[PDB]
Design a protein around this nucleic acid. Structure first.
Lengths: 587, 242, 557
DNA sequence: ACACACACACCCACACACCAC
DNA sequence: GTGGTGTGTGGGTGTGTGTGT
């Protein structure tokens, strides 16, 4: 839905001397540069300064400053301008015009509330105020003040505790009254927010349905391979379940780049506009005759000629013959398939070689938006028995009518849901991956490895000695063992969107605490190239536009990312002797 | 397949031209996808909206009575003005008029007087003629008493009585569109926004020589999650027609 | 890219005679049928292969000095398939017998060709490169024979001459692929051919080792395995990548590795040619990607710069900055790094594939001592089920990923490792938002009954053989290339939509291999209904019970 | 692997309607 | 009289795919 966020950054000297204003500026920079890359027209931002030394306000109230008015859509240029404006204000008012003590920060909240009610008087827009204050137990908002404030605000408050220090016990008061009175109000420590904005951001791709049909075992091929309004339920001695297929494991492309041509600018700056790609066909006229001569004279010519796409036809290949098909045969050269999942049989998990799977994974789940809950029971029972007997099912899979025909393997998998109730209520679904055809198989015969023999088959020489070779390699494999890192439980590998959706597009430390301490899985690592280039772009914008730097200072990849892509160490071990006895030499 | 075979583009463009009153709808492209062997209603609508909307040029003549429109011989006339949509959007002036009408009706209900001047009258020996309209007399004006008539009236917390007669009279006197649209606009936007709030906002914006925005983002009702969406034109349907 | 096969089949009285091994199918007929199937498969898989077939010793007048050229060493052509299929049809219908075709009279003392002229012809065939076809990248000779003791076997000087000819053939890169046939009632003696065809691998004293290659594998193959051996010997090793495997970084414990794609994705019509048809002259039409300036309209291809768009801002990272940014986790060239060894019960999953696996085999041509290292690693990884978690990119222009090097089991003939790719956290999609979640769990009795019934049904359709790709031909590719084939030969295409339910079903199962097995499943369900025996009548009863349970539940809730 | 063009799915605030106590 | 729900639209956005380098 439509959302609006407002930021209040305390300028009082407690913030300024503690450098928490710099932390607030960095967090706002990250959040706004994140909002700018989407530039949604319904994403409002607005930043105020509370306990400010110099005040300029639209309602004529001192110690309240609107350093940035309401803005939508957020843009990179606007973000850079606002961030550098706030930095300039901080620089100018740091020492010579620094305030004293802690002023009345409640006054800022009232002005911000009035401005919010002016901008969003009755719209059903999620309004938000995210205040950064350095003192919670020091500021006093009395009972009348909090009552009037909670009467004025229908908006949620995200109060950030920028000042936290170690102690054997922590106690706070005062500010909790306003948070408690207003529903959906939250409190966080600022270091947690900085950690969250440091961590990589996972993709949130919406689940889009790919296939919708029936998972039928024993269905008649005459009533299922025909263009008919009704489905496979013309027979009453088969099994038929309506299911739909969603993506389950799809490869991610790198960060988007754009090819552009440099154009003019007011100050001869860099302005880049993306080019348009047009396809164009050409032929080569082979006129290349050269005149004879008694010297090096061999001049000739070779030029192409552009022709339209209308007078171009596909010449398919059959061995050594490139032929063009008549119009009628082109309609005949396509296999007319029909959507559906036709079960071929059930085989054990180890009876299907793992290298057979040849494409991206997909979900299979009972259709609930067009079918009945009887389908739900049937599908759940099938998945449960497949899991109990550890079975995989091979099926003839056609997603849509025009698509290819595939032989696919159905793997039963459970998926964990929080659900409205405390009971977790595992959800049963199949997982689909395609198996190769006769023409897909490229399996050849390779020379043997364990006990090498010559090409003719007689055994090869036993070299010098292999007794220590395997012992040293065994020690090597135990050195890097990662069995101490737990693997994600069976069911939590796939998490539903319901566990990841948030009502606000603001980076927060999140409430899903199950994902904590379950990232130890050495195989589930965040995408690293995409995050690397995203961080590089963020730092480029920061240094070269906000700090007005001159030379880029490319950051180091965080140790949190490097740890999962660098060698592991369980037991200390040196492989130098193994290298020496294995006779490894680069050629 | 997975293309649009320019003759197909011209066919769907002609079909859209035949019904200019359904160019931006969603059912028309579903019917086209039913008739066209390939492509779905969503795909056809996207194709027309992005690419073929630039080549519409003309629409075959369509009038209220009726569609299509031919000449004496029976030929098809092409016009360069597209008829309006079937869902008329609301504007600031319409909302202001509705707010004023509701405020005046509520004021009449309680104080038994209609702005600005006239007062209630009852027949004794001479009648005010037709009784369908208000039996009103302007003679006892201006009244010596002090009344909030009418800009000083505060209409908050008042939600009736209104009934069906008031909206029928509003649609007749204003000579505007259907009564259901006015009723839904009123109940879902003006009441949830505030009649006096919108009145003050409109008056203030008009005073400062600025155009006030009409009410927006005031759904106030759920989208009813848990049930199929009312209208789907994807590869699933593709409904069968006869 | 190219490849030249050369079918050389030696004729014998036993070869013409049908053998009970193939159930009264002649070994020569089996070889010819294997050739037909091989050509049919290769016209789809790899059309660049060049195939020729020669028979000897035969009495045909066409036979040039005793060798009969069924079709010469040329690129794969539809005409040669038509000729071979006509031969097969004549053999099957009984019009012409094999003896009549090859004019092989059964005397018991038939003459034989001398291997010297045979091998010179083998060398000369690969020398007469056709001007109308491209050069031969790989050269082979599929040697079929049954006479293990020819006339030249007794001599020893002409054995040296044959060795010289074999050395010339190897120097001309014409490797042999032998198909020596042995029977249960008649074993095959291997001494002569092994003597001639090997280099004589002898240990080079104490001054090092000798060449690993010695000669072709002359082990006799039973007549039961002729077709399976021919059909699986036509494939060329398609090297995907060759990236060093850096087992230990600091100590330079790095070995070479080769990567071969076990399986691919075959598409119906990607091989084509854009043709500019002008009246009667047909010629190639090429496609170019002309870039346009959206402001002026100039052809701007070749003068563009890549920029990163963040918002309404374009970041122009130069070449050096991109080089430094990329090098934080990957080098310029392909590589694979051993990160950690992990158990096989927690890393290999059947529900998280994102790509097709590759076959890893050692490479000693660039880093010495790779075969020893990887052989020891393969030995160790199995016998205690484990893997090797890798990190790198298999192509220079690609993105890194974290793989799971797994050791091949003892079942597979090939020895090596399989390289699956582990999905990133971004790539693991999210389960959709379902519209209902109370499937059957609360209803314990009904759910228990329904799942036990579904378990009963599942036991009937267990796949004893398991999935075999050879049993499933790709229907789209089959139909496309069948249309191409029967159009090229002017064979009428089959089209009909008034077909009877019996014949339309037969056509559908003839075009689709999977539909045959689906009809088999349906027939298995049907027969359980009709049969009177109680031991087999259970399947239809279980299906009917399942269908009744299916109908009940949408009414109760 | 990568950018750009294109096809199809999905959304949602809300004019416009109808129905029920 | 008045509240409740239901369909379909007007203007989009998101996601997956194909092709040439």
């Amino acid at each position: 839905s439509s959302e609006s966020t407002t930021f209040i950054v305390d300028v009082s000297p407690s913030m300024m001397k503690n450098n928490n204003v710099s932390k607030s500026m960095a967090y706002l920079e990250y959040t706004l540069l994140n909002k700018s890359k989407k530039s949604r027209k319904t994403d409002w931002i607005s930043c105020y300064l509370a306990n400010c030394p110099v005040s300029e306000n639209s309602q004529e109230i001192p110690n309240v400053f609107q350093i940035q008015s309401f803005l939508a859509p957020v843009t990179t240029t606007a973000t850079i301008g606002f961030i550098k404006r706030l930095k300039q204000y901080c620089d100018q008012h740091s020492h010579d015009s620094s305030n004293e003590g802690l002023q009345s920060m409640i006054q800022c909240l009232l002005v911000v509330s009035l401005d919010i009610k002016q901008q969003f008087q009755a719209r059903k827009i999620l309004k938000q105020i995210v205040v950064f204050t350095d003192n919670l137990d020091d500021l006093d908002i009395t009972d009348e003040e909090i009552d009037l404030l909670t009467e004025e605000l229908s908006t949620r408050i995200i109060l950030i505790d920028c000042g936290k220090d170690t102690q054997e016990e922590r106690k706070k008061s005062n500010w909790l009254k306003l948070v408690e009175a207003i529903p959906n109000s939250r409190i966080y420590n600022m270091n947690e927010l900085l950690v969250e904005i440091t961590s990589p951001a996972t993709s949130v791709v919406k689940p889009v349905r790919v296939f919708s049909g029936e998972l039928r075992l024993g269905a008649d091929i005459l009533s299922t391979q025909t263009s008919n309004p009704s489905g496979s339920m013309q027979d009453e001695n088969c099994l038929c379940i309506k299911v739909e297929a969603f993506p389950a494991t799809k490869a991610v492309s790198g960060l988007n780049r754009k090819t552009a041509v440099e154009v003019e600018d007011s100050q001869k700056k860099e302005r880049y506009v993306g080019v348009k790609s047009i396809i164009e066909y050409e032929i080569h006229n082979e006129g290349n005759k050269k005149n004879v001569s008694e010297d090096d004279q061999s001049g000739s010519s070779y030029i192409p000629v552009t022709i339209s796409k209308d007078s171009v036809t596909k010449a398919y290949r059959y061995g050594a013959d490139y032929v063009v098909l008549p119009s009628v045969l082109v309609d005949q050269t396509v296999y007319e398939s029909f959507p559906g999942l036709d079960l071929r049989g059930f085989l054990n998990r180890e009876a299907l070689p793992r290298y057979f799977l040849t494409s991206e994974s997909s979900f299979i789940t009972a259709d609930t938006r067009l079918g009945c809950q009887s389908d739900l029971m049937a599908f759940s029972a099938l998945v449960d028995v497949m899991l109990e007997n550890r079975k995989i099912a091979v099926a003839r899979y056609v997603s849509k009518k025009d698509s290819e025909v595939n032989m696919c393997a159905l793997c039963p998998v459970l998926i964990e849901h929080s659900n409205i109730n405390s009971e977790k209520k595992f959800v049963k679904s199949l997982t689909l991956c395609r198996l190769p055809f006769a023409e897909d198989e490229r399996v050849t015969d390779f020379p043997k490895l364990l006990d090498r023999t010559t090409t003719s088959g007689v055994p090869l020489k036993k070299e010098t000695d292999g007794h220590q070779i395997d012992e040293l390699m065994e020690q090597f494999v135990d050195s890097m063992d990662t069995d101490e890192l737990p693997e994600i439980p069976l069911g939590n590998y796939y998490q539903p969107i319901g566990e990841v959706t948030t009502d606000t597009t603001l980076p927060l430390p999140s409430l899903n605490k199950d994902q904590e301490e379950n990232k130890k899985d050495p195989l589930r690592i965040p995408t690293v190239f995409v995050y690397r280039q995203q961080q590089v772009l963020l730092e480029w914008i920061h240094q070269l536009m906000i700090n007005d730097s001159r030379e880029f200072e490319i950051p180091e990849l965080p140790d949190s990312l490097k740890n999962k892509i660098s060698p592991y160490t369980h037991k200390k071990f040196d492989s130098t002797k193994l290298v020496e006895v294995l006779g490894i030499k680069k050629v | 397949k997975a293309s649009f075979t320019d003759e197909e583009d011209e066919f769907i463009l002609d079909v859209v031209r035949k019904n200019p009153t359904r160019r931006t709808t969603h059912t028309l492209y579903d019917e086209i996808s039913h008739y066209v062997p390939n492509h779905t209603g969503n795909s056809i609508r996207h194709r027309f909206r992005v690419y073929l909307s630039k080549r519409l040029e003309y629409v075959y003549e369509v009038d209220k009575f009726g569609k299509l429109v031919r000449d004496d011989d029976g030929n098809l006339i092409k016009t360069k003005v597209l008829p309006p949509s079937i869902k008329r959007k609301f504007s600031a002036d319409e909302d202001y008029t509705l707010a004023i009408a509701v405020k005046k009706q509520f004021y009449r209900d309680l104080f038994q007087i209609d702005p600005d001047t006239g007062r209630s009258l009852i027949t004794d020996e001479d009648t005010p003629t037709a009784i369908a309209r208000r039996n009103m007399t302007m003679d006892p004006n201006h009244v010596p008493g002090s009344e909030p008539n009418f800009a000083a009236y505060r209409t908050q917390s008042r939600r009736g009585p209104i009934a069906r007669e008031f909206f029928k009279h509003f649609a007749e006197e204003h000579a505007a569109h259907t009564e259901n649209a006015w009723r839904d606009r009123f109940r879902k936007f003006l009441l949830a926004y505030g009649i006096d709030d919108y009145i003050s906002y409109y008056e203030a914006e008009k005073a400062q020589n600025r155009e006030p925005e009409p009410m927006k983002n005031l759904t106030n009702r759920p989208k009813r999650p848990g049930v199929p969406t009312p209208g789907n034109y994807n590869s699933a349907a593709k409904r069968a027609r006869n | 890219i190219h490849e030249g096969i050369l079918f050389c089949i030696e004729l014998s009285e036993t070869m013409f005679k049908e053998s009970s091994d193939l159930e009264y199918k002649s070994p020569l007929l089996e070889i010819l049928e294997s050739l037909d199937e091989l050509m049919s498969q290769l016209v789809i898989t790899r059309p660049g292969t060049a195939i020729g077939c020669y028979f000897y010793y035969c009495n045909r007048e066409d036979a040039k000095e005793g060798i009969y050229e069924l079709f010469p060493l040329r690129d794969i052509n539809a005409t040669f398939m038509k000729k071979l299929n006509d031969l097969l049809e004549d053999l099957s219908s009984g019009r012409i017998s094999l003896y009549d075709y090859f004019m092989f009279q059964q005397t018991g003392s038939e003459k034989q060709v001398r291997l010297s002229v045979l091998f010179t012809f083998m060398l000369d065939t690969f020398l007469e490169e056709i001007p109308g076809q491209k050069q031969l990248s790989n050269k082979r000779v599929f040697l079929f024979t049954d006479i293990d003791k020819p006339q030249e076997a007794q001599d020893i000087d002409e054995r040296a001459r044959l060795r010289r000819l074999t050395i010339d053939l190897f120097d001309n890169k014409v490797n042999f692929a032998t198909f020596f046939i042995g029977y249960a009632d008649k074993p095959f003696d291997n001494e002569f051919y092994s003597d001639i065809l090997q280099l004589g691998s002898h240990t080079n004293e104490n001054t090092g080792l000798d060449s690993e290659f010695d000669g072709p594998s002359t082990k006799p193959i039973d007549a039961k395995y002729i077709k399976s051996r021919i059909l699986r010997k036509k494939e060329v090793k398609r090297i995907m990548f060759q990236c060093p495997l850096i087992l230990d970084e600091k100590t330079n414990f790095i070995v070479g590795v080769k990567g071969y794609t076990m399986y691919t994705h075959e598409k119906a019509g990607v091989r084509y040619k854009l043709v500019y048809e002008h009246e009667d002259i047909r010629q190639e039409a090429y496609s170019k990607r002309k870039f346009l300036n959206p402001i002026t309209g100039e052809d701007v291809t070749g003068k563009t710069v890549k920029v990163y768009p963040y918002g309404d801002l374009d970041i122009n990272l130069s070449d050096s900055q991109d080089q430094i940014v990329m090098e934080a986790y990957t080098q310029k060239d392909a590589f694979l790094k051993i990160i950690g060894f992990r158990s096989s019960s927690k890393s290999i999953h059947y529900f998280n594939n994102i790509d097709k696996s590759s076959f890893i085999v050692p490479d000693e041509a660039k880093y010495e001592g790779s075969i020893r290292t990887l052989a020891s690693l393969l030995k160790i990884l199995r016998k205690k089920d484990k893997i090797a978690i890798l990190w790198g990119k298999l192509k220079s222009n690609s993105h890194p990923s974290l793989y799971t090097l797994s050791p091949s089991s003892v079942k597979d003939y090939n020895e090596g490792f399989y390289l699956y790719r582990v999905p990133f956290l971004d790539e693991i999609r999210k389960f959709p938002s379902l519209l209902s979640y109370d499937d059957g769990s609360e209803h314990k009795l009904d759910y228990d009954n329904m799942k036990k019934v579904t378990q009963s049904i599942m036991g009937y359709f267990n796949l004893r053989d398991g999935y075999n790709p050879s049993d499933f031909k790709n229907p789209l590719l089959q139909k496309h290339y069948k249309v191409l084939h029967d159009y090229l030969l002017q064979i009428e295409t089959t089209f009909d939509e008034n077909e009877t339910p019996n014949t339309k079903k037969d056509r559908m199962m003839r075009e689709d291999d999977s539909l045959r097995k689906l009809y088999y499943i349906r027939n298995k369900i049907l027969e359980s209904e009709k049969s009177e025996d109680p031991i087999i009548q259970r399947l239809n009863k279980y299906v009917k019970i399942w269908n009744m349970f299916y109908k009940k539940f949408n009414d109760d809730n």
